[PDB]
Amino acid sequence: SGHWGAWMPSTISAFEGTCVSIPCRFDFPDELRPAVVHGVWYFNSPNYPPVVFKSRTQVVHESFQGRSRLLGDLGLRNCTLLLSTLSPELGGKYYFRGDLGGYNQYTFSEHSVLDIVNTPNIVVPPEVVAGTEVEVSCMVPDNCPELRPELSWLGHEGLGEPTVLGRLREDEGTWVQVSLLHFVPTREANGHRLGCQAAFPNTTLQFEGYASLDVKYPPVIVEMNSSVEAIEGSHVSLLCGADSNPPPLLTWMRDGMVLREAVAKSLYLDLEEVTPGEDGVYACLAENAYGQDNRTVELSVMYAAAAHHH
Numbered sequence: 001s002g003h004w005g006a007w008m009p010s011t012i013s014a015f016e017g018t019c020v021s022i023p024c025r026f027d028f029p030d031e032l033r034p035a036v037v038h039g040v041w042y043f044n045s046p047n048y049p050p051v052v053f054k055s056r057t058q059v060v061h062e063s064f065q066g067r068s069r070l071l072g073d074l075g076l077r078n079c080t081l082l083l084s085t086l087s088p089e090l091g092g093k094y095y096f097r098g099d100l101g102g103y104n105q106y107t108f109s110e111h112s113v114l115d116i117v118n119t120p121n122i123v124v125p126p127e128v129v130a131g132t133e134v135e136v137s138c139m140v141p142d143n144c145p146e147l148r149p150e151l152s153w154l155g156h157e158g159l160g161e162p163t164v165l166g167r168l169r170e171d172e173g174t175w176v177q178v179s180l181l182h183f184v185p186t187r188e189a190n191g192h193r194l195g196c197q198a199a200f201p202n203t204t205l206q207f208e209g210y211a212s213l214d215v216k217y218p219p220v221i222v223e224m225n226s227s228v229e230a231i232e233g234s235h236v237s238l239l240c241g242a243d244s245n246p247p248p249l250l251t252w253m254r255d256g257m258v259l260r261e262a263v264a265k266s267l268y269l270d271l272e273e274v275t276p277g278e279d280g281v282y283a284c285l286a287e288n289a290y291g292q293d294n295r296t297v298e299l300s301v302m303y304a305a306a307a308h309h310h
Ligand SMILES: *[C@@H]1O[C@H](CO)[C@@H](O[C@@H]2O[C@H](CO)[C@@H](O[C@@H]3O[C@H](CO[C@H]4O[C@H](CO)[C@@H](O)[C@H](O[C@H]5O[C@H](CO)[C@@H](O)[C@H](O)[C@@H]5O)[C@@H]4O)[C@@H](O)[C@H](O)[C@@H]3O)[C@H](O)[C@H]2NC(C)=O)[C@H](O)[C@H]1NC(C)=O
Pocket: 021, 025, 071, 072, 073, 078, 079, 080, 145, 146, 148
């Protein structure tokens, strides 16, 4: 109580070409009773930081000229800063310095890191599995009073209609715009391109961000031979194809014995000089981390080989 100190969000973000208001409050010993309260805003991009604002001499660095103005009264312990027409160069650390005349100048420790962005924020859970309810969100910074972002999805036709949460508060007292997608994805939703757009009315500013859904799903054996009727002594190739994400482990088996095994989309089982001893049921097993599938095929050597003398 009645102490040198400041209060501002450690981090804050805004769209390139827009504005940002950095909420700021500072305090000082009440015993001072200054007739006039002065202040200085400094900028550190990565020992001579450019001056954003300085009430004393009204000096403004060229990078901030006509792009920065102090909001709120310093006499009311309110050092809120507005930065306008933002460009990537303005990204960095901002800190405030109090000046109550005499030797009562004070550079406050707490600062604010401004992040300037050009794409909306799409949040997708690290593991998306088919058959489970999934939430996807588009987040957008909302710290510009003069310009409000309109949020919209791109290529969301198969995922259902969005649910707009609106302006939400995050930590440090900053704001975001959030829109949601709640859906149960099938295997078809794998690779689906998801896009979000942040547009500002009465401007030409339009920001787009895209992401691709990685949908995991169990194997479905889609390629499989029908009942094989082979010629004596011929060559027989059995093919088992499987569709899964991630790619499946394919296993050819007969009589409880693994004939061939490989992590692939398709797996061939080659039988040479086919004899009646090769007759029987062959099984193809497909499995990944999310499920399994299996089919069988009966091999029948029912065609006698013709003699071959020339
Ligand atoms: C330190 O000083 C700073 C600056 O002096 C103070 O910050 C200001 O505080 C005042 C309150 O004293 C605020 O003024 C209020 O603003 C409210 C804003 O809400 C409406 O107005 C907007 C107009 O641009 C409008 O966008 C908004 O949303 C509408 O549009 C959206 C899309 O267009 C849509 O999503 C919405 O649903 C809605 O339709 C609202 O309608 C307003 O409601 C109040 O009546 C009052 O005017 C300033 O905005 C603050 N300025 C800044 C830069 O933050 C700060 O409080 C001081 N600190 C202390 C401790 O005193």
